[PDB]
Amino acid sequence: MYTFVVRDENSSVYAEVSRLLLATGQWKRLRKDNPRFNLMLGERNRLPFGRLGHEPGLVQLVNYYRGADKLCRKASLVKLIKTSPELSESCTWFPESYVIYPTNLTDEREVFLAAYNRRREGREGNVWIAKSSAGAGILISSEASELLDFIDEQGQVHVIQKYLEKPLLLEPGHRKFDIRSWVLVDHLYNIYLYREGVLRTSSEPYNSANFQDKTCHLTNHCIQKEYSKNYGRYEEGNEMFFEEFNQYLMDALNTTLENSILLQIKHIIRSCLMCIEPAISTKHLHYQSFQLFGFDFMVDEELKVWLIEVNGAPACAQKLYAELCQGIVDVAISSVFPLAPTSIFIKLHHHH
Amino acid sequence: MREIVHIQAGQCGNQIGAKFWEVISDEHGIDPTGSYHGDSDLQLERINVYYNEATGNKYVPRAILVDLEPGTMDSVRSGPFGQIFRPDNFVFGQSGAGNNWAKGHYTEGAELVDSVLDVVRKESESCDCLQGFQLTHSLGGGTGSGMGTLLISKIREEYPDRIMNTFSVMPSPKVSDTVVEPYNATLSVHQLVENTDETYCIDNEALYDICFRTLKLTTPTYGDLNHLVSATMSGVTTCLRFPGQLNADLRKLAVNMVPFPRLHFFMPGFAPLTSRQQYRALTVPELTQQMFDSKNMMAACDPRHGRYLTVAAIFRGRMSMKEVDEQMLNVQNKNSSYFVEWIPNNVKTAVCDIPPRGLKMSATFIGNSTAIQELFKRISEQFTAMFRRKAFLHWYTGEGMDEMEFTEAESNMNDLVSEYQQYQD
Amino acid sequence: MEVIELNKCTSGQSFEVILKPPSDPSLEEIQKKLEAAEERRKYQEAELLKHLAE
Amino acid sequence: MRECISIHVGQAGVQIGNACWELYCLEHGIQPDGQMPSDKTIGGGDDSFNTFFSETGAGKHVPRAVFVDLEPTVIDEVRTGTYRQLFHPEQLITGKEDAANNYARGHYTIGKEIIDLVLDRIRKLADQCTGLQGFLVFHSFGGGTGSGFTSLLMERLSVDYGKKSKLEFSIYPAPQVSTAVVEPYNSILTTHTTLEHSDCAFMVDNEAIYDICRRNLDIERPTYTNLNRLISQIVSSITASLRFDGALNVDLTEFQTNLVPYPRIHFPLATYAPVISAEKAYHEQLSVAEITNACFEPANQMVKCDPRHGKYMACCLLYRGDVVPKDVNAAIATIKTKRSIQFVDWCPTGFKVGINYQPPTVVPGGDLAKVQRAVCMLSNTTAIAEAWARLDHKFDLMYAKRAFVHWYVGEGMEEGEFSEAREDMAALEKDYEEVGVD
């Protein structure tokens, strides 16, 4: 009879796991302050890792990798890619990005302006996007003056990265989109990719001449269901799954999702996770960790995959909550606490 | 040299105290004449905690026998180990107490208490360093209850910085001498709330049900009940009478068990408890499962109706101390809801290599549960059922008491119950 | 990876390696504390004896 | 040469002091009777070992130690043990009844009545000193004497020896060996009143020593002897520089200089390798790089935490045995490219290394296997603050209900000293965060 506790009531993913663990009749939930737990569905912010693994006779497991915020923060991811030899500054699957501190506070203001002027002079596409972790607040502009002035009006750190002016557009619709992949890392640091991704498509035709109306440029599910007038027109809730997106790629581009996109995605997932594996691995630690991640990719018209961001506390697609949550319990929880297929995951092998 | 002074008052107190000294006298190799005849030095390492050493290498229990009638103590002096007790430590009168608290506390007792304290003071003055006193007594009679709590009130006055522990037998209508036992118990419980650091609550009902249901005794006697108490009393004092990584006296044990000065009433427990299948080996998981089972509790309180403030287990015998740790952690982990989370690691465990007579291994349980309030509720209800009609009060008013003293003792105990209740939430 | 201040002797040696450069209460006040606590112990014990006398 | 006085307060401190002086004697070749053949200067001398030992005209080498316990059963073992001839009676002080795991009892009630006797016996050792450096105070956190009396002794030592340095070896409480529920109270009470009086403190978590004993030594249920022989190894590695010819950590002031740039944050983490069971058939002797790499595995630290997520302020490497600087640098470079070693921006990213060619001495019959080389790393990570958080958390759970507080007040302590000491820890936990997090 394993015991667990819940410290994140707002997590829909683990709300279903806590629901599934109980349904096994072998897991007993405790109060959120009882320290005699086998598993902790911990809180997002300021999770007390220091208080784990000090309970005699209890093997303790938490659903967050201490230090994984280095990869799940806008300003942290950029700093991690540029400064990590495994990723180097010449990383080819990540857009050119710069960390910009508002003037009311190192900072890459002059470094970003250097490359910007180079593009302005060389007649090249010079359209950037400014965003931050404090957003629901994004500004897509082609003038450097507007980008830097938009950040000074704020008080938090922001990042300016090259906006993909040539995004792959689904037809019919001539619309943008982004791909979401769920990756579960278990206590042994096996990288499991969920076979089921989701494309959060824009119902508005992409318009490269009007970055003011950000409804055809931002594929967020909340922006398309609030400021887009074609929501739910082409696909239910602006969400295309792999089966349809694959068939389309076959009919339109005469290729498969696995060959033209999935290989690049799996290569990006491995590169990022293996990079920080020494900094967050819980192999020789007094407690074990696992964590579910949500990778957001972009695909340009050349069928090249780009990494947008990594989500540390990602939510799932309404259809896949069942299959995925049962997968979290199978390989993450029951792998350490066994109960008395054809995996739904793609194990990305690697050297530990 | 950390001596304890033992005091046994009344019929219950002296009959149980006798069996207790009989049980540990055997464990320490002391024979009915006080001559050591053991085979281990562990038997004499802490022998001075309860025994004084006289000429000829004789060991005399540091015990003081008290009663207002000579009957019960005459038996003790004629019992198996009667000769082992210091003659000058038999202090008794002739009037008796008539199962009357007021006679033991105010009248008959008052006339005899000074003489008892003269023996107490005589036993203390010879202590290299007195840990404190322990009293065995019932709360339902007159001497053990009325005069016992009077002795406690005077021992605290003369030794205000010494630990006072008691083994208190609580009255149950199922094992009753007289109908005024709830009166005498309610009056004594208030004394114990004030003037004792630890009180081992021994409910005569629990001792009966165990003899009847578990031990399969068709008709239990006071002797059968006292056998359990003799074994449990020897179990808790094991760590005190034998060596080990414990290093614990009465004050250090009280500190780890009493989070609040008035909530010091403990539920005892013993394991094994077997009927005559009595030769079977008892495994460490079995000892632990039973020791936490309410059926092995001697306070007639369901622990699942409350929460443990603290717990202490004392295992005896040659066993896997690793397997002990694993099992103790198993009980807490598999039931952590029943242990207050605002006192971390409130379950402590001690081991002793010397097991009781004729027992490969055993476990003694000491629980500070808020479920003990159920015990004080029984007494409180039985009290009120009679006091509302002022029934049988004439026995007490005739000795100088006033109904107000009753109404206050009634309140004090109902307060005590409310105090347990607030910490159960 | 610079070694500095290397010292050697018969029973061992010691050095320093730099991988990168950078970027009370008086005796009086104690006696008072120890006596203030002994006074609260006497006051407490007096309230007990006063209680036991009543 | 300058002398160091060792003070062992409480059961933990005394039993650990006993294990250390046993080891000091094996290393320095001193017999249980105090005779040291290799010492050619009889009844005198200013050798490096004379910082811990004095001499008598009869060639006896007497530890500069003082054992203090409020109850005599533990110190009586010293009086009749194998090394009973090392100490003379004046050195062993014992009371009548202990503090019952009650800080206020050890600091106030019983502490007041014996402190002057202690300072007197300490003044007798100080008078045998031509240039006293300071004191090494071995004590537990959870014990009533260890915590309560030590903080009073520390307050008075800072008075009668205002210029001397004071280092602590402090036993952190671990439930797997503790029998006291109020140890969180005592630990925090003694950190509060001792913080400003201690210049460097080495915390040993009994939890850490317990697993290192079960994992590496294959002891199913380790006793205090197992835990102590291992702790006296780490203590020896730390005090070796004061007892042997060298140039790193040669006097007590050097520990503060090399390890504590900020005064309040004077709790360096200790990591020791290798720990090899003596019952092993025969172990493959580890290399300089192998044992040096293990200095960054949490399973060899004296306080379980994760330095990867803190920032270092200093770092020492104390090697013993067959080790040469070349091999040290090779392993260091290799570890910088494989380990997360973040320093504070206001401190250099470096390693002070010390090497003693004499390998670790192992108590005959003990549990540790003789190895050819060993190391002990003294790093000052913000990650050790995890131990304060754990402790502080437990304090808050009980004190919210005022649980057990009545025992302390009854001994003369005021309920406010609780919150006063708990606020200090709140400040201590903040500094660690100011220096460690971004």
Ligand SMILES: Nc1nc2c(ncn2[C@@H]2O[C@H](COP(=O)(O)OP(=O)(O)OP(=O)(O)O)[C@@H](O)[C@H]2O)c(=O)[nH]1
């Ligand atoms: N590592 C180690 N810890 C010990 C040892 N002895 C006791 N402890 C720990 O010390 C704590 C209890 O403090 P003690 O030193 O025993 O108590 P004390 O200092 O003698 O103070 P008193 O309350 O007066 O007995 C517990 O956490 C024990 O686990 C020991 O020999 N080695």
Ligand SMILES: Nc1ncnc2c1ncn2[C@@H]1O[C@H](COP(=O)(O)OP(=O)(O)CP(=O)(O)O)[C@@H](O)[C@H]1O
């Ligand atoms: N460099 C870039 N080029 C093209 N599009 C970009 C881009 N950066 C962001 N976007 C657009 O923004 C959307 C996602 O923004 P982003 O993920 O940075 O904000 P966010 O983190 O608040 C949303 P979520 O965390 O849910 O994925 C995507 O749909 C993408 O089309």
Ligand SMILES: Nc1nc2c(ncn2[C@@H]2O[C@H](COP(=O)(O)OP(=O)(O)O)[C@@H](O)[C@H]2O)c(=O)[nH]1
């Ligand atoms: N367990 C046990 N209980 C007893 C014994 N004798 C009396 N009692 C209980 O104690 C109460 C009577 O008190 P008693 O000791 O006879 O009165 P006293 O002699 O004036 O102290 C009743 O509740 C009895 O059930 C005994 O030998 N063993």
Ligand SMILES: Cc1ncsc1C(=O)N1CCNC(=O)C1
């Ligand atoms: C509390 C107590 N009172 C009388 S005996 C006793 C006891 O045996 N123990 C076992 C050891 N550790 C404890 O904390 C208590």
Ligand SMILES: [Ca+2]
């Ligand atoms: Ca008369």
Ligand SMILES: [Ca+2]
């Ligand atoms: Ca000499």
Ligand SMILES: [Ca+2]
């Ligand atoms: Ca000072």
Ligand SMILES: [Mg+2]
């Ligand atoms: Mg986001």
Ligand SMILES: [Mg+2]
């Ligand atoms: Mg009777």
Ligand SMILES: [Mg+2]
């Ligand atoms: Mg002690």
